[PDB]
């Protein structure tokens, strides 16, 4: 996996234009908001588990039909699954709000989720809507702590619905 | 998305965009402010919509399903009702049908025939959602709405 | 980005733990019969199955009051049991019949713990209510469903870290009710002392595990910086099933110490095959084994280092699928990522097979999970978490086909995260035939399997290799192509025919057998052989007389009995819809939108239409008109690369010196 | 083919819910830059050709490619470079109308490696065109519209490494 | 892996008779090469590093596989293909000694191609570095032993494509 | 083979033939003549010792399956014989026990014991077949012949 | 025109129009006041923008057909730009190229080649004309009409 | 070449080549050495052709990119002008324009328009070359190159 900074210095000698203003320009704009990523995963961090537990519990609200018998959140088994997985999907998200990349996202948490999820049977509708709120959760969370230009934050968890839902249209 | 529509058509010939996909792109982000309140106004009614439009389609259309006693098969037709409700605000959105024509047009006659529900019923489900929508809109508000609605009944014929 | 795909294995993993399925899996994990005892515990629990149907029915009688009375000892200033909902039966579903034709109208017509309070009803709220009732039912719901399972595991599994999932302020009166349940369920026999322990027995258990305040997750840590750590919850663990781990010991009988070793041979060789293969030196091995000179991990490091292993899983194979089965002989799991693929490759280029076991076997991944005494065992879903990158080729890894297929599963995939979709059809690479003169050669599924399935969507167009063939006039267009093998200007054309007989001898580009023979040649790849032409002589007569057109020639050649069994009565239906495209359109199909659009031809009318929807298309038209016989126009990729296999004349390599004197250093004494 | 609209409207509706205050927002940045896109669309096919030609002459001209035994001699072998240019101009240009990428990746890169590997089209020197005519359309329609073209540009660049 | 000795046992075994004496003409013409086998064996021991550094010099210097972007950049791709090499030369090797191309079916080409194609290797080029080797071999060890090497380089060639 | 058996370790060691392998190579490939003598040898009296060896391991072992009066398990027998005079000869011809090992070694305790055939039986039949092999071979041939034939009896012991 | 292209769209998918092709439609038809003062103004120009563009056109190429002492090609390279400047006006009330291209593009090649016309040399004068009848409209106008020049210039290159 | 023409005539009707395709085959082998003869003449005179040829094309069209007082484009056309001699060598050589075509004349208009050198201009410089071509040749010989030019010329117009 790669970070920012390290993508742009490889296609730096990659695309044989080196070190030019455009380049310059995206760097100079990334390290600005690098505080600020830092500060989002302190905050994501902190806040994990609350994260994580209001996220599952809104979308057992939204789909109370998961919990119920013959759901696939039915049984603590299941139950416990669910939260090990929005864990994972938050720690991988703030991964790359951290990193500036997607890359982590591609090699870690994408890579054969697909496969993963179509032989458990793991709906994708759900996954996605839970992202979702914890997406929410976190813009909340942020916006509590005083963060103003967070539109990076969304960057990741959009990404990931994207990767993982199916094509409608 | 009439965008896509416009892209496919130009790249059906090889070519940049013709003035006429400019013209017709320019006008729909023109008019993009105006697809987004028709779509809100959709999504925030959408439970009055289906709530008047099944009372009128229970009283012109009785003999129906969702009008069997059957409490998860009436549930199952306002859960569809509001589902066609989202996809035309989608189209609304996307200015095309694509999104309607997509999720929930292509293969409608086999899914519902499959599940055994006449389809003039659904016809007449339709059009009382139609009439219920179109009260909550101006007329060029509803002008798109009425052309998707219509587009739904003549795909279920 | 991530569109390869390492397939999706069809997984069922264990919910809870029944005493038939603990004792099979115990036996089938050790790869023999059933022992005296096991069949014993089989029997003794079915004869006792009558009883725990008895138990567990006279607990379903009585479900309302028990519940009833757990509620009543914990809930006040309402009715408890009016949020119990009972499960719906779902009545009139599509093809019950329950509705006849279109007429839906006439189908109808122990004291309580210190300072512990209540819960009042009113202001405990509906939804909460409804939770706790729900709860309780479900509770002696999974208490009937362990009495009759033989086993309290379906219990242990889904209440252990169920404390904080139910809200921690009522964890005690959750225990209360439960209590108050017990008693009313001890109050149904009285007069048993077996079935009492039994019921009693289960709501300790269950009891006894709620009570566990926040199990830990069991933490996978990554080995190395290239691969993930994970976390599994223990109720995972807990109902999945159980491996049998073998610990040598040197104070252990002979007979344990063989056992052990059974399982060594087991893990290392996927199956006790010493004795099949003669494999004597295993002897001595085992004595210094048994005499505790050496280690399981020492034993094993020698074996992999054996003829034996050498024989079975490296001649075979590949390095790439040799290094990725020792992976599972060695660490039990398949490779997680392809950095880890690459240390393992360098190792073996290095030093070869013996350095590729000492690099698995001192790895301290093996000391972690295997240590020096322990059996090495297969790992996987249910043992610990599993990651998802790795996720289609471990499964079939651990699966006993794994060594029957040759192509790498692990290097491959893992190489294919990384790039854009692949140059193949959308429905995989078994559906893209050689693009050969004549034959639809395909491959097999099941013989010398490597399909990579890549998610390809509705809209993928692929990118094909113009031929350059075709008449002047029909191109300029797309002249830029060129293939070899290509016929460019020779296409066959026939212009229309327009009271007197004709001249004896009248000359066109290719006589009439000759034309004829082209376009059997085209339509069918080659010339058939000498009665085969017999059905479609009068349509031959019908071309020869201006009475049809060449695409109706065409067509009628495609619709022939003759075309149907060599393409399509014994191929997999959208390989067959490929292959007449390619030989009619004279192309591959461009995505799944044309291939969507002929599968649902051929299932809704057929073969006959497929051919019709093909001939009739507006590109046929465009391309071959009605005076044509097709051509190809479109190679792949790899079937263009087949046909050059010749690249001596780029090899070309890559005068006055540029300095004077060379090499000499300044000031030279 | 998706667009931002259909990108957004796929996501919620894999949800089953309507377009929430965020996608909506995402929606009315896409109907802001609209303007912007159809006058770039518009500059780029005025001067298609011209960004072709100086493509060209910057990156491959008067160089090993264009001479005897490299990718870009005889007549057929140039002409289809250029025509590779332009078709990676042009689908630049509808993925920049689209505001997404979605139809570079199912039209442009799918099979692209294996193609140009088959037919030993140098992969480097297709990069560096692609790099150069970045350049080129930043330098003709502006720095805004030039990074929004550039955007796609460097995911057709990415996508051929 | 079995050799030509192996072969012709394995031909005359599925019959289950003996050899006839056309499979024992071609044994000891087999027993008869074995001695120009071997010192084509010696020779190529001797030289495999530099046959595969003039390999790679009239093969794939100074195309685009070594600029950035093509497959051989960065230190760590080129090692690979060099290495990739020693693995033909020494397994062309193995199969000229064993008289047949089994062992390169065996342990190279099943599935090499399918690899090969998801990292991203071209096969033509790396095809045309086989035939360049094919030639070093033959300007090394002479124009007999360098057919007989010919043999199995054109075997790996054709097994690749 | 041998061949493949030097080139095996070479494999599996990631390093060209050692010149001690080389020598190996070069010294049994100057042997192939009287290696396909001797198999000519063996195959050309494949019947009179099959016949021979017969005769004496069922003078020693009369209680056996081949003489049992079943014509069948007789014939079965003595094509199991030549069989294995057959497995040896190739093993002359290859310099080494893989051929036999590969055809007739793998698996022939499973396989006999399947059949219900005592394998000390087949071992005393070997014996008796190395006996008559010897008989009519020279002294300096009979050492890979006799090997194999115990390499086949030490097999099924 | 567009509404034709509409109309046999519909027809290739045997369909009514579906709501982007009325949307298409509409947004055609309200801009008929726009496209027909367009085609005034073009037509009512025809002569000047023929004079100024054939003024510019050979100042910039001295050694053409039209400029070689010949009256009659002189007059038929003014007619021919007035007759190009007519088909951009019927192609401007169309909405569509497809008279331009119908009446004065397929085969224009063939056409000028056969007259021995330099079709670089009409390119520059339709580069002219365009320069000239561009000076007339206003920004929102002159869309199409460049589009349409840049159509004709295109075919003839 | 020839020769392939001839064998994929034959392939297309899947027949050995017939006996009149034998006869040309062994016609043009056996007048393989005027066509070596006339190669040499045309790569030995190359230069003075080239030269000539562009002071001949320069006298009819000096205002060209060649002629601009830019160095580097005047000995780019004159290599130019010097490859396609090679090329009609090559043709000559071969019996047939299929060198020709494949190497210079497939394409050809798209590249040089993207070097935005006018057609009009290489269609000269390719008359003036061809005169000089064949001013150095006897009619006999001349015959097929000034096919070929033709042919160059025509790939061009
Ligand atoms: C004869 C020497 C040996 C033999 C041959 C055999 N071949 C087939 C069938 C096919 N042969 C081909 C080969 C080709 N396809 C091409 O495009 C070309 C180049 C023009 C060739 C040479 C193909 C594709 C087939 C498939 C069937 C078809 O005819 O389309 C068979 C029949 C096998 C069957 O099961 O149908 C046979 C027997 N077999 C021997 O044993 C001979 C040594
Ligand atoms: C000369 C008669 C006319 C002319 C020519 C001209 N050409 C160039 C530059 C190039 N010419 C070529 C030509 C070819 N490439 C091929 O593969 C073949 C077929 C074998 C041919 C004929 C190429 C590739 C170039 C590009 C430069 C390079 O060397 O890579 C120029 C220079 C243009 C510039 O500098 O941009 C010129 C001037 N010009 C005239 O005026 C004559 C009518
Ligand atoms: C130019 C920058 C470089 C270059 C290019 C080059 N390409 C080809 C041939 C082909 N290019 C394609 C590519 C596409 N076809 C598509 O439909 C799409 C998607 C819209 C793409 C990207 C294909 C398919 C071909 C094959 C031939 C054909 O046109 O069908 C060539 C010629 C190769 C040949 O000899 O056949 C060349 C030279 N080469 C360079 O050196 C430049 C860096
Ligand atoms: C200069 C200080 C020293 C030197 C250099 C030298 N290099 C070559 C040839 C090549 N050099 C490279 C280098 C790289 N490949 C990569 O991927 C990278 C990125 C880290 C680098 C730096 C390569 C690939 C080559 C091969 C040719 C090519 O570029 O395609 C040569 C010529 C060797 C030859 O045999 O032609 C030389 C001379 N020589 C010295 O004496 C210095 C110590
Ligand atoms: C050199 C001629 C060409 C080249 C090669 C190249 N290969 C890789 C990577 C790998 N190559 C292999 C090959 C094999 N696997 C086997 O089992 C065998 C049989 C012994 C062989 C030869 C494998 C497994 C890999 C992947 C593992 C690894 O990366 O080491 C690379 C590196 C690719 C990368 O992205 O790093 C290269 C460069 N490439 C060219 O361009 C040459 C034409
Ligand atoms: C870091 C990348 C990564 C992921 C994502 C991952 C997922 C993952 N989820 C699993 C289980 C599971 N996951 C879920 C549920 C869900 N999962 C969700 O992401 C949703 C929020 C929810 C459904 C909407 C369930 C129910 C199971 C258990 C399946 C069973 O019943 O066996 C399993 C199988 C058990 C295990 O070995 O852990 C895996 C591998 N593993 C990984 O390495």
Same mark, same amino acid.
């Given at each position: ?22 380049? =310059? ?12 990523? =830092?500060? =989002? ?96 959760? =976190? ?31 | ?46 439970? !009055? ?22 409490? !998860? ?5 306002? !859960? ?5 409700? !989202? ?71 | ?35 005296? @005892? ?21 607990? @379903? %009688? ?120 017990? *008693? ?11 079935? @009492? ?32 750590? +994970? %976390? ?148 996987? +879903? ?29 290097? @491959? ?15 995989? $690479? ?90 059997? *040649? %085209? ?78 031809? $051929? ?34 990729? *790899? ?6 296999? *010749? ?23 | ?22 996608? &909506? ?86 099979? &692209? ?49």
């Amino acid at each position: 996996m790669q970070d920012k900074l390290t993508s742009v210095a490889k296609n730096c000698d990659l695309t044989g234009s080196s070190l030019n203003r455009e380049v =310059v320009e995206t760097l100079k704009e990334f390290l600005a908001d690098g505080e600020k990523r =830092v500060q =989002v995963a302190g905050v994501i961090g902190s806040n994990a588990a609350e994260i994580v537990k209001t996220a599952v519990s809104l979308l057992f609200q939204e789909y109370p039909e998961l919990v119920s018998p013959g759901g696939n959140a039915y049984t603590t088994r299941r139950y416990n699954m669910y939260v090990r997985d929005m864990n994972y999907f938050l720690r991988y998200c703030s991964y790359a709000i951290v990193a500036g990349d997607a890359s982590v996202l591609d090699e870690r948490l994408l890579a054969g989720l697909r496969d993963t999820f179509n032989s458990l049977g793991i709906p994708l509708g759900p996954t996605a809507r839970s992202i979702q709120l914890m997406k929410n959760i =976190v813009k909340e969370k942020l916006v509590t702590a005083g963060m103003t230009n967070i539109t990076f934050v969304d960057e990741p968890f959009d990404y990931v619905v994207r990767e993982i839902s199916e094509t409608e249209i | 998305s009439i965008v896509t529509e416009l892209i496919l058509n130009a790249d059906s010939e090889s070519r940049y965009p013709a003035p006429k996909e400019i013209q017709v792109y320019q006008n729909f982000v023109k008019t993009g402010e105006q697809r987004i309140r028709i779509a809100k106004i959709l999504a925030e009614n959408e439970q !009055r919509i289906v709530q008047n439009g099944s009372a009128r389609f229970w009283e012109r259309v009785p003999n129906t399903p969702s009008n069997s006693g059957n409490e !998860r098969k009436t549930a199952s037709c306002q !859960r569809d009702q509001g589902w066609y409700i !989202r996809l035309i605000a989608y189209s609304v959105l996307a200015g095309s049908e694509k999104p309607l024509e997509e999720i929930g047009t292509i293969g409608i006659k086999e899914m519902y025939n499959n599940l055994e529900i006449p389809l003039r019923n659904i016809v007449e489900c339709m059009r009382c959602l139609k009439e219920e929508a179109l009260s909550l809109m101006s007329e060029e508000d509803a002008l798109e709405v009425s052309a998707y609605f219509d587009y739904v009944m003549r795909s279920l014929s | 980005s991530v569109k390869a795909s390492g397939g999706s294995p069809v997984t069922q993993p264990q919910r809870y733990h029944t005493v038939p399925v603990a004792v099979i899996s115990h036996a089938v994990q050790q790869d023999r019969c059933l022992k005296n @005892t096991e069949l014993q515990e089989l029997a003794d629990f079915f004869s006792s199955g009558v009883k725990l149907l008895e138990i567990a029915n006279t607990l @379903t %009688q009585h479900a309302d009051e028990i519940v009833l009375a757990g509620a009543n000892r914990i809930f006040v200033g309402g009715s408890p049991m009016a949020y119990l909902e009972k499960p719906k039966e779902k009545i009139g579903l599509p093809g019950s019949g329950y509705y006849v034709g279109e007429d839906f109208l006439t189908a109808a017509r122990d004291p309580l713990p210190g300072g512990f309070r209540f819960i009042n009803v009113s202001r405990y709220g509906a939804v909460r209510m409804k939770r706790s009732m729900r709860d309780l039912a479900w509770f002696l719901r999974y208490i009937t469903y362990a009495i009759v399972a033989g086993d309290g595991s379906i219990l242990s599994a889904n209440v252990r870290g169920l404390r904080g999932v139910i809200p921690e302020d009522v964890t005690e009166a959750t225990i209360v009710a439960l209590r108050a349940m017990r *008693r009313q369920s001890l109050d149904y026999f009285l007069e048993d002392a077996e079935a @009492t322990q039994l019921v009693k027995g289960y709501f300790d258990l269950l009891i006894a595990e709620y009570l566990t305040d926040k199990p830990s997750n069991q933490v996978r840590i990554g080995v190395s910086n290239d691969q993930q750590g +994970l %976390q599994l919850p223990q109720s995972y663990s807990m109902s999945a099933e159980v491996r049998p781990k073998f610990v040598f010991k040197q104070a252990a009988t002979l007979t344990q110490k063989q056992e052990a070793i059974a399982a060594i041979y087991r893990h290392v060789f996927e199956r006790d095959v010493t004795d099949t293969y003669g494999f004597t030196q295993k002897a001595e091995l085992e004595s210094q084994l048994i005499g505790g000179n050496i280690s399981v991990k020492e034993f094993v490091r020698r074996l992999g280092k054996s003829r034996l292993y050498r024989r079975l899983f490296y001649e075979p194979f590949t390095i790439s699928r040799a290094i990725e089965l020792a992976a599972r002989h060695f660490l039990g799991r398949g490779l997680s990522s392809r950095e880890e693929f690459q240390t393992y490759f360098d190792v073996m280029t290095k030093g070869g097979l013996p350095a590729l076991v000492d690099a698995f076997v001192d790895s301290a991944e093996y000391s972690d999970y295997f240590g020096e005494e322990t059996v090495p065992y297969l790992r996987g +879903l249910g043992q610990e978490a599993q990651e998802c990158r790795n996720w289609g080729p471990q499964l079939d890894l651990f699966k006993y086909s794994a060594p029957v297929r040759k192509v790498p599963q692990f290097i @491959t995939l893992f190489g294919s995260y990384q790039k854009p979709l692949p140059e193949q059809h959308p429905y995989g $690479c078994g559906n893209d035939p050689l693009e050969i003169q004549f034959g639809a050669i395909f491959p097999q599924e099941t013989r010398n399997p490597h399909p990579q399935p890549a998610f390809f969507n509705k809209d993928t167009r692929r990118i094909l290799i113009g031929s350059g063939a075709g008449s002047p006039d029909k191109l300029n267009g797309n002249a830029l192509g060129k293939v070899p093998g290509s016929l460019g200007t020779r296409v066959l054309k026939l212009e229309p025919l327009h009271g007197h007989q004709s001249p004896s001898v009248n000359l066109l580009h290719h006589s009439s057998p000759a034309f004829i023979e082209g376009a059997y *040649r %085209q339509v069918f790849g080659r010339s058939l052989y000498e009665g085969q032409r017999q059905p479609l002589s009068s349509t031959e007569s019908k071309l020869l007389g201006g009475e049809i057109s060449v695409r109706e020639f065409v067509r009628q050649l495609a619709k022939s009995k003759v075309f149907r069994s060599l393409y399509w009565d014994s191929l997999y239906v959208t390989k067959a819809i490929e292959y007449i495209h390619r030989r009619l359109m004279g192309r591959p199909t461009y995505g799944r939108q044309e291939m969507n659009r002929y599968y649902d031809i $051929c299932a809704t009318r057929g073969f006959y239409a497929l051919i019709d929807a093909i001939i009739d298309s507006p590109e046929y038209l465009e391309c071959f008109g009605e005076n044509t016989v097709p051509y190809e126009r479109y190679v792949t990729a *790899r079937g263009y690369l087949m046909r050059s296999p *010749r690249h001596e004349n780029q090899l070309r390599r890559e005068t006055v010196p540029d300095k004077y004197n060379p090499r000499k250093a300044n000031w030279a004494a | 083919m998706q667009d931002a609209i259909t990108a957004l409207i796929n996501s919620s509706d894999v949800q089953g819910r309507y377009l929430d205050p965020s996608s &909506l927002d995402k929606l009315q940045n896409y109907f802001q830059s609209g303007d912007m896109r159809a006058k770039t669309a518009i500059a780029v096919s005025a001067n298609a050709k011209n960004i072709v030609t100086k493509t060209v002459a910057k990156s491959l001209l008067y160089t090993d490619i264009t001479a005897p035994g490299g990718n870009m001699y005889t007549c057929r072998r140039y002409a289809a470079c250029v025509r590779d240019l332009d078709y990676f101009l042009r689908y630049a240009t509808y993925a920049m109308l689209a505001g997404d990428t979605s139809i570079l990746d199912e039209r442009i890169l799918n099979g &692209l490696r294996e193609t140009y590997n088959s037919l030993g089209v140098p992969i480097g020197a297709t990069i560096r065109s692609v790099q150069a005519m970045k350049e080129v359309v930043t330098s003709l329609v502006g720095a805004d519209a030039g990074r929004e073209m550039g955007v796609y540009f460097d995911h057709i660049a990415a996508g051929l490494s």
